[PDB]
Amino acid sequence: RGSTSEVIEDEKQFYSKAKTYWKQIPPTVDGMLGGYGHISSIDINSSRKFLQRFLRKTGTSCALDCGAGIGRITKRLLLPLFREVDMVDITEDFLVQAKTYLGEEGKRVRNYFCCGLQDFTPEPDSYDVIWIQWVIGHLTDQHLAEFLRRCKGSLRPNGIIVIKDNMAQEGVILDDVDSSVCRDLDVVRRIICSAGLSLLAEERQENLPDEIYHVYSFALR
Amino acid sequence: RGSTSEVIEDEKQFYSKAKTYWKQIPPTVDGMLGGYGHISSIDINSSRKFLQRFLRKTGTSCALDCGAGIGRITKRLLLPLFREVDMVDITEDFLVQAKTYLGEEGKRVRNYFCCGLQDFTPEPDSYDVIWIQWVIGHLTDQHLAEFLRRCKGSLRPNGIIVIKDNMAQEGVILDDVDSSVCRDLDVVRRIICSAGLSLLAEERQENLPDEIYHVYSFALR
Ligand SMILES: Nc1ncnc2c1ncn2[C@@H]1O[C@H](CSCC[C@H](N)C(=O)O)[C@@H](O)[C@H]1O
Ligand SMILES: Nc1ncnc2c1ncn2[C@@H]1O[C@H](CSCC[C@H](N)C(=O)O)[C@@H](O)[C@H]1O
Numbered sequence A, B: 001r002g003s004t005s006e007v008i009e010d011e012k013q014f015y016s017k018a019k020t021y022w023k024q025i026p027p028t029v030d031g032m033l034g035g036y037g038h039i040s041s042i043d044i045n046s047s048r049k050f051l052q053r054f055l056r057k058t059g060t061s062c063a064l065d066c067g068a069g070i071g072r073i074t075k076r077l078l079l080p081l082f083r084e085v086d087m088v089d090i091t092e093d094f095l096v097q098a099k100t101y102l103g104e105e106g107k108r109v110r111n112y113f114c115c116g117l118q119d120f121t122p123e124p125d126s127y128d129v130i131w132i133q134w135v136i137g138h139l140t141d142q143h144l145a146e147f148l149r150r151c152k153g154s155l156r157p158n159g160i161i162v163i164k165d166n167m168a169q170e171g172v173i174l175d176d177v178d179s180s181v182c183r184d185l186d187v188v189r190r191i192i193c194s195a196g197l198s199l200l201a202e203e204r205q206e207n208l209p210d211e212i213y214h215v216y217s218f219a220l221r
Helices: A011-023 A037-055 A072-078 A092-101 A103-108 A141-154 A185-194 B011-023 B037-055 B072-081 B092-101 B103-108 B141-154 B185-194
Strands: A062-066 A084-089 A109-114 A127-133 A155-167 A172-175 A180-183 A199-204 A214-220 B062-066 B084-089 B109-114 B127-133 B155-168 B172-175 B180-184 B199-204 B214-220
Touching (some): A037 A199, A084 A092, A103 A109, A127 A141, A185 A199, B037 B155, B062 B072, B084 B092, B103 B109, B141 B155, B180 B185, B185 B214
Parallel strands (some): A127 A155, B127 B155
Antiparallel strands (some): A155 A214, B172 B180
């Protein structure tokens, strides 16, 4: 199976089941990472090193955290590097928790957008960095392509989009646990290319548990 | 006479004669406006003010210019305000000219649809604004109602349809020059309500030559 259209039986249910799954997840780092909270530091440090290359130039004024959850990434990666951050997530309870989780530094979160990425239009020329981590599997192929194009139109000069996510060994696979798909590297690269985005960097995440999907970062604009 | 069914003798001929009329019209603003090219600025400027009331919320991703001709409206009203525009018109030569007329900004016209509105089905979830100007008189009452129902089905959330057109003092009047009708305000309102639309705003156009039909704008959803 090479596309979401093949594997998703009913698009409305694909989205509503995902919302229902996330509604019952603890609003904690462990919850955000599916019981793998302990990998957060290795993930964040690797993400920082990847992002720092572009800030040696990409601007430091504003970032957008997509599928931000309670703000694991906003706390440790984005807020230390960007003067302001916007967060978008489908799960209201996570964004409410974010306000506590993020503490004093979280007062620099400008907008908390409670919204599906498939329904979200980032404002034109607004963001230096748009971070999209462990959420692309929650969108259809068409919605992903379209969102990426809207993201591109939301970038400031020299701004970048970063996708960081699990890659499948082959094809497109439905996870009926959380109502998401996982796609292989070639599938993801094709969707990016078809969105008219340039691939500025690609990097496999190392030092990771073996029984979980491989993780790639892609910087785009 | 209170309906097109009481004035149009042969429906096929009503459509074919209009197509023939438009085929021999020069592809210019003066041709679009039947010799009143000079009213274009007062018209466009009034349309902009009318529409901006909804943009200040109706989205700005995409518009549909119905009976667009060479793109008089697409050029001055829609392309500046909307990220993409689709054009639909029965007259192939006008849409060809449009590619020249629109120039550089015209590169952001997504689709050129050569089709009668009576045969056109805008696809679900496509448009923030559907603009229908100086063309409703080319459709029968039933095709008009059905088209407007189709349009409603294609609107994005908060999206609107705008009709801007000549209104007759009374009844339904046939123009056997261009093979169109003009309908009074009551007739037009009846057709709107029957299409399951709500009236959002109505505005009479000011500063027009006294010898031409009154013009009204209706915003609908
Ligand atoms: N369609 C959708 N649009 C926006 N957010 C979604 C979504 N589907 C799932 N989500 C959110 O995606 C997140 C995935 S868990 C990952 C959280 C965060 N990116 C991190 O790495 O820490 C959850 O917060 C869930 O609520
Ligand atoms: N049935 C029909 N479906 C779609 N377009 C039609 C049509 N009958 C006539 N037209 C088109 O309607 C237009 C009317 S002239 C007005 C053009 C444009 N709305 C403007 O205001 O500048 C012409 O371009 C003509 O080709």
